[PDB]
């Protein structure tokens, strides 16, 4: 009658197993102790359910305490080490000014659980009373009441966990709440011991419960473990690659160079008017983006972009904040508050899709990437700034990838992606088919130089690039150009700077140039008098020889990091400085 194994196993039996494992020296011994607990569970299960029919009961109530980091059903506990300290100080009735109280309070980073254990052990002699199931009920209570900001009920659930458990169970309970058990055995090892297929399964369903239920019998595997509709799969990952080796790395055959967006990795699951969104760690973001075309920040706007033949699909991409007025994606690192601006409709959510894993009743994971891309084009018609196919192009040249990387950094992207056209989709696997390339930046990151010129181009107009200079050391009235740098308004402060500078630009005349600003072959469309301009902080990979600038050199992969409006124009970097820097 709805019976469960967890309802018969003392949490104490779980914690003694954990203790034995943690205290065990070698991998083999650690594994042994786990197999022993597991096997008892499985044999008891068979006994408990021999007569029972169609049972959903499994190792899950234990599994989730053993791998607390993978809990997805329960929301956050919201319990601080310092909050426990206080509860424990009051409850154990410690001298409020004594070493024990203070050691719990002033705890920083011996985990807290151990410090707590050594205070508890002399004082808390009770034998434990709770089943694994009851521990789960109480943890559920904490999470649920956390979500509701019902602090008092939270205390009461905790007080039932503590006063009902032994000292040793509390040490483990604390680790289960912090979600760091410190067993000295990887979660990969845990899955391997549980079932040959546990890890593969977990990668395409970020769900311990399904993993435990479906693989409850060790001696029967699953085949064609695959991405399935409404199951969070772990994203495929890009490995770092040095530019020098790329041609080899892409197997000396054609490859894709795709835009690298720094957003939130999000997967979209679609069946009709029903949508689910999962983040990279397998959390549900459907409340924000929209379950149905009538709800949320995205779904109502993209629902009708899906072509007529499309009833079911699974997409992988990045959520970006798009600025409609400048047609620009906003970078994560800004002084400004992106989520609020998206909620205030100053920015909007844009889904940039680079992959598709299922279309209708058809699984795509084991298709060539090239085939997947073809299919992607058929999935939906893009709407700029809401749902888009990430831009890609074919290439086979190390040369072509530097071009890509140069233009990427120029447009204030932070790198590029390189992908094998024949590669298949491999959940949670890093590298393999996908590489990422970024500049080799050298910590040179604090180049503070003056804006002396600008270039109009794409976007609202607003400027696409700045020309920057260093100061000639005065006995500052003369500057020497050093580099063009991308100006795109990927952060509002660059946009605000533009409005600040607007009234100061002056037409640059090659045949009658200003004296305060000395140029190489690179001339700006407009310039600005130095006393009217602003220092920007520039990150660069290196300084290289160049006749385009007066300094006789320029910056490789430059990028504005900060607007240093906290420094007067005359605080500019000098040639003398730059010379010293090159060494």
């Amino acid at each position: 009658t709805s019976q469960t194994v967890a309802s018969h196993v003392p949490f104490a039996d779980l914690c003694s197993t954990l203790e034995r494992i943690q205290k065990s020296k070698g991998r083999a011994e650690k594994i042994r102790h786990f197999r022993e607990f597991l096997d008892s569970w499985r044999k008891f299960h068979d006994a408990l359910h021999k007569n029972h029919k169609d049972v959903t009961d499994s190792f899950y109530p234990a599994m989730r305490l053993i791998l607390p980091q993978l809990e997805r059903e329960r929301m956050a506990y919201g319990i601080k080490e310092t909050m426990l300290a206080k509860l424990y100080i009051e409850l154990l009735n410690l001298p409020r000014d004594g070493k024990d109280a203070l050691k719990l309070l002033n705890y920083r980073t011996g985990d807290f659980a151990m410090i707590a254990y050594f205070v508890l052990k002399p004082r808390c002699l009770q034998k434990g009373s709770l089943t694994i199931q009851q521990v789960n009920d109480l943890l559920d209570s904490i999470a649920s009441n956390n979500s509701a900001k019902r602090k008092d009920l939270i205390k009461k659930s905790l007080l039932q966990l503590i006063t009902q458990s032994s000292a040793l169970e509390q040490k483990w309970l604390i680790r289960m709440i912090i979600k760091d058990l410190k067993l000295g055995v990887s979660q990969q090892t845990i899955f391997s011991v549980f079932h040959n297929d546990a890890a593969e399964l977990h990668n395409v369903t970020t769900d311990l419960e399904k993993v435990c239920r479906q693989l409850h019998d060790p001696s029967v595997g699953l085949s064609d473990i695959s991405i399935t509709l409404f199951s969070a799969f772990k994203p495929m990952l890009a490995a770092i690659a040095d530019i020098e080796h790329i041609e080899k790395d892409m197997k000396h055959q054609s490859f894709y160079i795709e835009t690298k967006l720094d957003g939130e990795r999000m997967q979209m699951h679609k069946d009709g008017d029903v949508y689910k969104y999962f983040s990279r760690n397998g959390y549900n973001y459907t409340d924000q983006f929209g379950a149905s075309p009538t709800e949320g920040s995205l779904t109502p706007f993209i629902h009708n972009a899906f072509k007529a033949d499309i009833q079911i699909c699974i997409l992988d991409g990045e959520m970006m904040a798009y600025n409609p007025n400048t047609q620009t994606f906003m970078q994560k690192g800004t002084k400004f508050d992106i989520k609020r601006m998206v909620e205030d409709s100053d920015l909007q959510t844009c889904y940039c899709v680079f992959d598709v894993l299922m279309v209708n009743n058809k699984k795509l994971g084991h298709e060539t990437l090239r085939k997947r891309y073809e299919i992607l084009s058929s999935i939906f018609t893009p709407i700029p700034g809401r749902i888009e196919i990430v831009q890609k192009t074919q290439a086979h040249t190390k040369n072509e990838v530097i071009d890509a990387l140069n233009e990427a950094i120029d447009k204030r992207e932070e790198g590029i992606m390189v992908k094998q056209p024949l590669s298949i989709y491999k959940p949670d696997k890093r590298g393999e088919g996908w590489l990422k390339i970024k500049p080799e930046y050298v910590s040179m990151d604090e180049l503070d130089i003056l804006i002396v010129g600008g270039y109009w181009g794409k976007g609202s107009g607003m400027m696409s690039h700045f020309l920057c200079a260093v100061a000639e050391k005065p006995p500052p009235s003369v500057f020497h150009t050093l580099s063009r740098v991308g100006s795109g308004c990927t952060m509002k402060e660059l946009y605000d700077l533009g409005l600040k500078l607007a009234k100061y630009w002056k037409p640059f005349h090659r045949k009658a140039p200003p004296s305060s600003i000395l140029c190489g072959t690179e001339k700006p469309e407009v310039y600005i008098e130095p006393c009217n301009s602003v220092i920007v902080q520039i990150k660069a990979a290196e300084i290289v020889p160049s006749d385009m600038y007066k300094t006789g050199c320029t910056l490789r992969f430059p990028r504005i990091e900060k607007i240093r409006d906290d420094k007067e124009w005359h605080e500019c970097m000098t040639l003398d400085d730059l010379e010293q820097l090159r060494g």
């Binding site: 196993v9 039996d13 008891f44 006994a47």
Partner: peptide, 10 residues
Amino acid sequence: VPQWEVFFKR
């Protein structure tokens, strides 16, 4: 009804 104590501590 199978009892847990004999499956674990055995």
